[PDB]
Amino acid sequence: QRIGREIRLTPRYRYFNFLPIMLVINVINLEEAIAQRTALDVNETQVTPAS
Amino acid sequence: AALSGLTVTGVGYSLEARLTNINQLEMGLLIDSDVQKQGFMIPTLPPLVIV
Numbered sequence A: 001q002r003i004g005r006e007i008r009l010t011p012r013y014r015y016f017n018f019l020p021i022m023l024v025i026n027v028i029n030l031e032e033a034i035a036q037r038t039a040l041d042v043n044e045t046q047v048t049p050a051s
Numbered sequence B: 001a002a003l004s005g006l007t008v009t010g011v012g013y014s015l016e017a018r019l020t021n022i023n024q025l026e027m028g029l030l031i032d033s034d035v036q037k038q039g040f041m042i043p044t045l046p047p048l049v050i051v
Helices: A030-035
Strands: none
Touching: none
């Protein structure tokens, strides 16, 4: 017994999936590389006697 | 002397509150209309005569 006027929208839709193929690539730490000291990750390789 | 050791302190209060009732929820008293009507009659009376 409360009188009010209502406007109602009735949605109807649905999503389907057919192709069973999909790829995901995930990227992290993007801001640090620009922010931090970035330079040649010089892999010093053992032609000074240690092996 | 009369106000020595006299303290005033607030304790409570009330509010004058009332509902708009845009949708109405209350009824209150009702009013009715009735007609009580009576009939009235016109007699006759004994006649007069001349010779």
